[PDB]
Ligand binder design. Structure first.
Ligand SMILES: [Ca+2]
Ligand SMILES: [Zn+2]
Ligand SMILES: [Zn+2]
Length: 274
């Protein structure tokens, strides 16, 4: 797998920040900042050769959208998917929650095209709308997939908050194989990981039997002294002091955590699609 360039991931975050500033300060469902975010991500994917689909749904009286991107080729009967929600709450730009996951998945998709990668399994990436209203977009996607297509899913990897300013490195403890894949990558960097315990888009998939996994760097919970010992940062302070707040801006990102988790996302996607 390629090393994902941190500068490219940060460039997507800068674009999402500008989009929020030009649209009222947020990228929330039913507000113009959300569709403008979908348009930026879709244009990058279309230029890289993906087949993109906009899925529309209505929630709370407003139109929301999921963006699905398929990389042509691979085994149509074994699909590996990775996703991240693209909406923010209305109080701010949602740069760590969840511009961080959205940008990492987008740069991983672009890396597949730049590398000329031809996976054994078919790759599909998704950016979900309305996660902050109760996983509405990912529930819409799973509820609308015919059982024949659901059975072709080999796994779903979720990235929601991966650049927290006072980070922890948490790996989901769902499918054992996906979990091991992420844990082995962090072991190679000598960065310890803990099981995720602190409610995101992998839930609809998990509920119907699709293997799931993912990464998380923490939100409102307080980092303990033992955790500050193994990862640095500040004990006694939240992992993300700007969770769902107006200060979840470009300055609410820890570059090391964002780089590590973006590289881990690419490693898992390359490993599991072989
Ligand atoms: Ca990197
Ligand atoms: Zn989130
Ligand atoms: Zn959130």
């Amino acid at each position: 797998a390629p090393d994902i360039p941190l500068a490219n991931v940060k460039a997507h975050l800068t674009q999402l920040s500008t989009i929020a500033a030009n649209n009222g300060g947020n990228r929330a469902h039913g507000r113009p900042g959300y569709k403008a975010s979908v348009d930026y991500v879709k244009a990058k994917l279309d230029a890289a050769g993906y087949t993109t689909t906009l899925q529309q749904f209505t929630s709370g009286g407003a139109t929301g959208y999921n963006l699905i991107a398929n990389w042509p080729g691979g085994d149509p009967n074994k699909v590996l998917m990775a996703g991240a929600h693209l909406d923010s709450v209305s109080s701010g730009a949602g740069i760590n929650d969840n511009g961080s996951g959205s940008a990492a998945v987008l740069e991983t998709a672009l890396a597949v095209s730049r590398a000329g990668y031809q996976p054994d399994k078919h790759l599909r990436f998704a950016w979900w709308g309305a996660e902050e209203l109760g996983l509405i977009g990912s529930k819409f996607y799973v509820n609308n997939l015919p059982s024949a297509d659901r059975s072709k899913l080999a796994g779903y990897l979720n990235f929601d908050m991966i650049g927290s300013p006072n980070p922890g490195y948490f790996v989901y403890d769902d499918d054992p194989v996906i979990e091991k894949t992420f844990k082995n990558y962090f072991a190679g960097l000598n960065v310890p990981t803990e099981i995720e315990t602190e409610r995101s888009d992998h839930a609809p998939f998990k509920n119907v039997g699709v293997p799931v996994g993912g990464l998380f760097t923490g939100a409102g919970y307080t980092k303990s002294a033992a955790q500050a010992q193994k990862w640095g940062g500040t004990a006694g302070q939240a992992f993300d002091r700007c969770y769902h707040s107006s200060c979840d801006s470009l300055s609410n990102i820890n570059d090391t955590a964002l780089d590590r988790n973006s590289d881990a996302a690419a490693h898992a996607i390359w490993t599991l699609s072989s």
